[model samples]
Target: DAGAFDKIQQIRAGDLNIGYVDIGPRDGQPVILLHGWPYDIQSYAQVAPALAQKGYRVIVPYLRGYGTTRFLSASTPRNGQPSAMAADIVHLMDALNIRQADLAGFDWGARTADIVAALWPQRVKSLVSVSGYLISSQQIGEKPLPPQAELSWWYQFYFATPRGEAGYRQNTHDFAKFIWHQASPQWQFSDATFAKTARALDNPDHVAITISNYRWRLGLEKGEAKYAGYEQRLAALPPITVPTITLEGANNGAPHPAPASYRAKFTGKYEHRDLPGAVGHNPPQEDPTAFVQAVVDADRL
Candidate 1:
C-alpha cells in the first residue's frame, strides 16, 4: 500500500530517459520530489500522493541509475558527480516546461535539491532538504572528520575500492538492504516494502553510478568537465536563498551535518525540525506526515 505510485511516466531529460511517477491535478503547482541513493520514488510513494491530495502536482523521479531511468547512449559516462545530478533535475524541469517548482529530497536527492536551490535558485520556488546545506565539493570532501564521524561513512570509503565495487555489483539487493538497515536502524520496514524499493537497484548502472558518486566525493574519480562551473560554485558551499525547511530524523544513523551548523546556509525564509521517534535518513518514507507538512509549510514561506 505504501510503495505504489499513481502513475509512472518517462521523459527524455538531459542524457537519459527519466522514469517518474506523476500525480495530482494537471494544473496544480508542480512539486518535484527526488529519491536518494539506495532508494527510489517509492520513498515518496506516500508523500507524493499526500501532496497531490492537497492540490500539488507531485513528480517523483528515479535519479539516473535507479528504477526505469537509463542513459540514452553507451558513450555517455555513468557519472555520479553532484553537479551532473543537479543538472539532470534542471533538464527535467526544462523538458517538462516547469519554469519553477518546489523541490524536496533526502540523502543524495537532498544534495541535488540543495544544489538546484543554491545555484539555480530562480528555478526553485522552495526547498525541503532532509539534511541542511548538503552541498559539497571535492575540497570539502578532502577534509577529515572526527574518527567516529569518519566511521559513519564507512561505505564511502568502501566504495572507493575495486573490491567494494565487485561486492556491491554481486550483491546489490543485499547490500542496499544492509544500508537501509544501517541508515535507519529503527525503521521496521516490511519485506514487501523493501522488495519494491530494492527492485530499483537492479538497474545495470546502479553499481557504477553508486561507485562513481562515492569515489568522486573522495577525489578518487574525476567528474565531467561540463559540470566544472557548477562544481566550482558548489565548492564554495553557496547559501540557498529560496524558502526552505530542513528536517532531520531524531535517530538518523547516517553521517549528516548538524542543523545548527547549517543555519547560515539558508538565508531566505527558513525553519528546521528534528523529528522525534525513530525516523532515520529516509524521512519521507519513515514519517510521511511530517515530511508532507514540511513541504506544505515551505511552499507558502
Candidate 2:
C-alpha cells in the first residue's frame, strides 16, 4: 500500500503474499503501522521513516486487499473481517521473525491494531489508535443513530447494496478521492499524493474487500465462519490491557465514538490526545509529528 524506503519485499504470510516496506535497523524494536480503507502505505509516508530514524524498525504493509499484497490461492476467501486483518499482522510478524512490536493505525487500521492489542496483548508491546478503541462486532444492536451521525457513514450504508458495490468497482479512484476530501477537509493534500495512494485501490480484490468491510460493519454481510469465534470474542468489547495512546483530529469528518465513551476500554496505562489545527481522519498523514510523538511516547508507557 505504501513505498519508497527500499525495494518492495514480499513474504508468504497466512494465505497471502504480504507486500510491505521495512525500514531502520533490523535489531530495532518493530512497529507495525496499518492503514484503513481508501488508504495505502503512503498514508504513513512520513510517520514510518520518522520512527525508523528513531531506531525503530517500522513495518508498513498494504493491508489484504491493497497494493501488491495478494491471496495465495483462488480458494482462499477474500475476507475483510477485522479479525482477519489482525491475524494478518500476526502472520506477518511470525513470517518476519519478529516476536513482538508496537502497533498503531487508523480507521480499519485502528480497529485491527485494537484487535491485536486486545486478543493478543503479549505480542503487542504498545499501541497508538487514531480513533480510540474501535473493536466492534456485527452483533452490536443496529439501532438507528441520529440523522447527522448516520449521514457521516453514508458510504457504509451505500456499500450494502449491489448497486453500490458495482458503483465502487466502476469509479474506485473518484469515489475514494471524494472520501479522502470529505474525511479530511482542512488538510489540503497534493493531487500527486492522492494519486500515488489511490493506485493501490486498483488491486483486483480491492473492490470485494473494501465493500465487504462496510457491508460487514452494517451487519448486511456475515464474516466467514472461520472467524465466527473471533467475532464472538470481539462482541464482548474486550478491554485493552496493554499500554496505549488514542488520538483524534479536531476536524475529522468521520463518524467516531466520543473519547469519553471509550476511555474505559483501555484497562491499562493509557493516554488520549486531541490534535488541533488541520489534522483530520488520516492523522499520520495529516499530523505526522504528533503521531510519531505518540508512537515514541507509547513505548515508554
Candidate 3:
C-alpha cells in the first residue's frame, strides 16, 4: 500500500511551492514528518509507510528551497532560520486544511518542529524530536565556540565564507556527497539510497538556501527584516511544554545534548530513549520499527 500515497504541491507562505506526500486514511489523525539538512523528504520514505499502515495520515514534505519546492520570489532571501522554516510548515498545514497535527523530525527538522511546538503549541498535538535540545536561542549561537567544538563546526564557518558558496555552486552533487560521508561516517548507506535524495539537491534553490542557512547562522547573511518580529520572540529559551519524546542513536556521530540537560524543557509527559547500536543520525531510517513505535506511542498521550 506504499504506492497508495500521492504527491501534492501547494503554495505556502512567502509563495513557496511546497511539495509533500500524503498517505493513509484521509480522515485519520495527521502526523507530519520534517526532514533535515542534506536530505530530502525521502528521508522518511520507509517510516511514512509504516505510519500509514498504522492508520495515521502521514505527511512528509521537502523543506523550503529544496526538491520541487520553489519560491515565487527568487529575489526573496532564502532564509533558513528556524522561525522562518517553522512558519513554512504552519503555512503548509493551512494550505492542506490541517488545523493541528503530531510532529516529528531530526536535525534541522527537529529544531523546526520544536519551534512550532513552543511558539504555537495549539497547532501541535505531540512532538518527537531527535537530538535533544537541538533548538537554541540566538544567545546559544552567539556563544564562543570551544576549540574542539569549533573544529566540529568547521563546515558552518566554511559556509559563511565566499569560498564555501562558490564550492557548493560549482559542485553541489559532490559537495552533498562529502556531507553524507562525514555526517554519518560510520554508516555505509548504498549509493542508490544516497542518490535517491541527492537528486533533490540538484535544485539550485536547495544549494542557495542551504548556503544561506549556514551563512545566516554564522551572521554572514542577513535574515529578512520582517522576520525580525519573530526573531525577537525567539531570543528567549522557550520550554517545549508539549507531550514529547526525544531519541538518540547510540552511534550517532553528531554531538548532542544529554537528556538531563534538557529534561526541564518538556513540561508535559516526556521520555528520552537512547537507541542502542544504531550507528547514524538517521534513526527513522536505521530503525523503523522503534522509531514508528515511539511515534505511535507518543500519540497515545
Candidate 4:
C-alpha cells in the first residue's frame, strides 16, 4: 500500500542519521531508489515493493532534509549542493557495506545518481535515471536560459528571495503540494498521497536545503569548500560509463532535458524509453510497472 511502508530504518550515513526503507532478501542484488525534492521515500512506495518481489534488495532513503534524516551536528551547514548529495550516497553505500548497486531516481535524486554514476562508476552497477544527465556546476548554472525556460524555473527564482524563503518556511506543505500539482499536472493524486509525502517536508532543515539548492545553482550562495574539487570535475560533465536506461514521462510537466539532448552523456550500453498513459514527472510512483521493468532491463544491459 502506498499509504505505508514496511519499516523505517535508520543509520549513521555521512553526516546524517539517515532514515530509509530496506526490503527483500538480504542476499539479493542491491538496488537503491532515490526520491526527489518535495517528495520522500514515499515516492518509492509502489516501486520498492515490486522490485523487492522480483528478488532485488530495494533501498529507499530520505534525502538530507526530508523524513527522519537529520544532521549529526547542528553546526553542519544545511547545504543542498549536488556534490554533497552525491557524496551522501557514497557514504551510505560504505556504511551499508554495499560495494556496488543498481541506482535509480527522479529530479534531485536523478541529479545525485547521475553525479555518482559519472564520478564513481565503480560503485554503480547500472542506472535508471528519469531525466537523463542532470549534472551541472554553479558556473554552468549562471548562464541565462531562454524566456520560456526561465519561466519554467519560476520556483527557483522564488527561492532566491528572502520573502520566498520565509513564505516557503511558513507554508512548506502548502507550497510543496502546489509544486506537486504543477510538476505533475496530469496526475490526479489524492490528498492522502500528498499528505503522506508532505510529512517528510516537515523536517527542520527542509526549507534551508530547498532554498540553498536554488540559490547555490544561480551562484547567489556558496557551497562548502570541501565540495570544490568535486564541483570542478562535475563541471566537465563527465560521461556515465555504466549501463543505463533513461526514462521520460510523455506528459511530464516538470522542467527536464529532452532525451536527445543528453544522449551522448551515457557512453555505456544505454537505452531511453518514454512512458505513456498520462504519466507525469514522478514516473516511479505514477507508473510502477514500467519503472520496475526499466530497472530490470538496465541490470540486464
lDDT of 1 by residue, 57-86 (tens): 988899999989999999999999999989
Number of backbone clashes in candidate 3 = 0
Model 4 clash pairs are none
lDDT of 2 by residue, 166-271 (tens): 9999999999999999999887999999999888999999999998887787787778887888888999999999999999999998888899989999999999
Supply the global lDDT for candidate 3.
Answer: 0.81
TM-score of 3: 0.95
Summarize candidate 3's per-residue lDDT along 1-301 as a digit string, tens digits. Answer: 5465446555565458787888888998999998888888877888888898889999888898678787878677777877889888998888889999999999889988999998899999999999876766555676766798777677777777789888888887787777777666777789898898888888768867888787767666667887777777777777888899999887776656767898888899999988877456777877778889889978876
RMSD of 1: 1.4
What is candidate 2's CA lDDT for residue 248? Answer: 94
Tens-digit lDDT track of model 4 for 1-301: 4533658999999899999898888899999999998888888888898888889898899999999989999999999999999999999999999999999999999999999999899999999999899998888889989999888788999999999999999999899999988888989999999999998899999999999999999988888999999998999989999999999998887899889999999999999998878888899989999999999999999
Cα shift from native, residue 250, model 1 (Å): 0.7
- Candidate 1 regions with alpha-carbon error over 4 angstroms: 1-6
Local error of candidate 2 at residue 75 (angstroms): 1.8
Off by over 4 Å in 2: 1-6
List residue ranges in candidate 3 displaced over 4 A: 5-14
Q: Report the Cα RMSD per candidate.
A: 1.4, 1.8, 1.6, 1.3
Residue 13, candidate 4: C-alpha displacement in angstroms: 1.3
